[PDB]
Design a binder for this molecule. Structure first.
Ligand code: FES
Ligand code: MG
Lengths: 14, 86, 135, 26, 49, 100, 225
């Protein structure tokens, strides 16, 4: 399965 | 799913689809209960109920969707416009 | 998960099928109540269409026999100065009093409207009702 | 059955059709 | 910065009857002033900005 | 011996009133805004009448007044509309104050 | 071992009775008639889907059939009580500004929730972003008025169905009841009618919550001894 590069810990991180 | 980046488009479409799920009634968990003839806009789809072992003899896109639904045996002929969304 | 396809089936059929398919791990709090005490109509989305050709709405006009008497009374006499009190559930207008009396004189055996109508007015005048004709 | 159900009539309160000032005159 | 407290408990029931508006404080105040006006109606500067 | 809905409808005071045009009815002022008086007379919708100049002071919330009804609900269909536009209020003329 | 017994005696027991909360005694056809529940809009305002519920037109004024209203209201009040008994979040929605104050008080009095204000886009379908990831949505939504202030269906009716939330609704003769789970055909304009609906739904909710406390207490007292 083509793995969509997953998001890291939310950068904004309010 | 729509986005400037292809990865964002994939994610948006994938995550939104699971919130818009249909339930498809499968006869004996391998085919459709009866032959379905339908026209959606200008696309015509004629599906036929088939016995076990027939396989999926339909448009490649329908084959993909049928595997996701769990239909193993079916025939379908698509006429008119071959628009993928229709 | 849940299905946001509100135009396909109802909230019940969608929930029943998804719980049945194993997508919804737990039935929602309302499901068991609906299953026990379902509504008279399954709430399925329908599209309102305009009526073309000879299609007409089946709603009928509500009429009663005494409307014929009421119409003539209002034409001959008109709405009396006495004001309708619609808050009182048992309010009897001068017209209704006329209808009631007229209906009683019909039981006697009078078969003509003109005479029967005239006789009704006289009875009310004897009782003290004020009947000022439009003329 | 019941006697209080609505019956089928023609609007008894219907007003006569309006006539122009010359209706019926040569 | 002053931060609003949790608006629902463990059970998940919000604590305010106007929670689902999204402006419970504003609309609660709006409700209060309207109520006072109703009661007042039924009963009947330079320095301050 | 339970009264059916049809029985209630036939005998209801509103049914025996018949057409509402030029019918004198008694309403109650339930809301007042400036000089606008919102009067309930027993119909589906209330009517709004301006405070009479002769005796405005007398008209207060709860006062019973005499009206002449013109329409129970102001509705009309304008060019291109699929349904009527409703004002959600009755049309009436405030005649005066009811005195017993 | 104890959870199943608790659930059977408490959660499943009420579902075996036709009128567990005795909501039938709260109203009669006479009481509905005296509140002007049968008075509909003019025939020119009629919605096609409300025709099955209309008794007739009296001088171009649609009369709602109160015999069907009674059966529809019985089911709506029964469903509301069972949800309050099950500790469900009930949200009252109405955009009629004549009754916003009344409805907001009724919700606070019965320990429920009211939304009488402008319904902002996504309150239900985007709640986790608007309120928070752990926000719990309503279990029942009761529409005292199903139309917004431009005489079109309140957006929450569609969004409630998207979120699979059952809806109770007073549907006048100009309303669209197709997506309302428990429609109750009746007048939604007259104060007397709206005051009756509020009294009926507030009582059913209060009755159900007290019954839940009584049943739980009896189960607990018996459990110890
Ligand atoms: S209406 Fe003009 S001729 Fe009769
Ligand atoms: Mg209405």
């Amino acid at each position: 399965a083509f793995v969509i590069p997953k998001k890291n810990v939310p950068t904004s991180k309010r | 799913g729509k986005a400037t980046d292809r990865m964002d488009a994939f994610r948006k479409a994938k995550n939104r689809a699971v919130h818009h799920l249909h339930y498809i009634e499968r006869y004996e968990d391998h085919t459709i209960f009866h032959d379905i003839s339908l026209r959606f806009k200008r696309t015509h789809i004629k599906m036929k109920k088939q016995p076990k072992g027939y396989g999926l003899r339909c448009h490649r896109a329908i084959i993909t969707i049928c595997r996701l639904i769990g239909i193993k045996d079916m025939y379908a002929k698509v006429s008119g416009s071959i628009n993928m969304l229709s | 998960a849940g299905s946001r396809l509100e135009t396909v089936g109802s909230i019940f059929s969608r929930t029943r099928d998804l719980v049945r398919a194993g997508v919804l791990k737990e039935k929602p709090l309302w499901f068991d109540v609906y299953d026990a005490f379902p509504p008279l109509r399954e709430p399925v989305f329908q599209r309102p269409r305009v009526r073309y050709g000879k299609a007409k709405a089946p709603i009928q006009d509500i009429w009663y026999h005494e409307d014929r008497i009421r119409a003539k009374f209002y034409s001959v006499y008109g709405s009396g100065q006495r004001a309708f009190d619609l808050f009182n559930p048992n309010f009897k207008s001068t017209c209704q009093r006329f209808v009631e009396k007229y209906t009683e004189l019909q039981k006697l055996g009078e078969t003509d409207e003109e005479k029967l109508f005239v006789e009704t007015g006289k009875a009310l005048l004897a009782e003290g009702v004020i009947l000022r004709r439009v003329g | 059955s019941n006697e209080d159900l609505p019956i089928s009539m023609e609007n008894p309160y219907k007003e006569p059709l309006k006539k122009c000032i010359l209706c019926g005159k040569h | 910065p002053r931060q609003r407290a949790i608006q629902w408990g463990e059970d998940g029931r919000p604590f305010h009857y106007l929670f689902y508006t999204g402006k419970q404080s504003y609309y609660s105040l709006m409700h209060d002033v309207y109520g006072m006006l109703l009661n007042l109606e039924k009963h009947q500067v330079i320095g301050s900005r | 011996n339970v009264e059916s809905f049809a029985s209630m409808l036939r005998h209801s005071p509103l049914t025996q009133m018949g057409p509402a045009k030029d019918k004198l009815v008694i309403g109650r002022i339930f809301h007042i805004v400036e000089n606008d008086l919102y009067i309930d007379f027993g119909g589906k919708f209330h009517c709004v009448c301006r405070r009479p100049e002769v005796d405005g002071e007398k008209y207060q919330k709860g006062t019973r007044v005499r009206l002449r009804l013109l329409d129970l609900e102001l509705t009309s269909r304008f060019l291109g509309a699929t349904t009527d536009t409703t004002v959600l209020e009755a049309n009436a003329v405030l005649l005066g104050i009811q005195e017993s | 071992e104890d959870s199943t017994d608790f659930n059977d005696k408490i959660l499943n027991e009420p579902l075996k009775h036709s009128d567990f909360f005795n909501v039938k005694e709260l109203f009669s056809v006479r009481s509905l008639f005296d509140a002007r529940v049968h008075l509909g809009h003019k025939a020119g305002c009629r919605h096609r889907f409300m025709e099955p519920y209309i008794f007739g037109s009296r001088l171009d004024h649609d009369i709602i059939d109160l015999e069907q209203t009674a059966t529809h209201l019985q089911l709506a009040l029964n469903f509301t009580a069972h949800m309050a008994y099950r500790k469900g979040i009930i949200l009252f929605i109405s955009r009629n500004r004549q009754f916003s104050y009344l409805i907001e008080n009724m919700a606070r009095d019965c320990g429920e929730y009211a939304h009488t204000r402008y319904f902002r886009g996504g309150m239900l379908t985007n709640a986790r972003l608007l309120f928070g990831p752990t926000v719990r949505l309503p279990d029942l939504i009761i529409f005292l008025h199903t139309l917004n202030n431009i005489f079109e269906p309140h957006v929450a009716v569609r969004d409630a169905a998207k979120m699979n939330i059952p809806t109770v609704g007073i549907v006048d003769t100009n309303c669209n009841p197709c997506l309302i789970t428990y429609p109750v055909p009746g007048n939604d304009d007259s104060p007397l009618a709206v005051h009756l609906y509020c009294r009926l739904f507030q009582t059913a909710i209060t009755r159900a919550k007290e019954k839940r406390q009584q049943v739980e207490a009896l189960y607990r007292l018996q459990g110890q001894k």
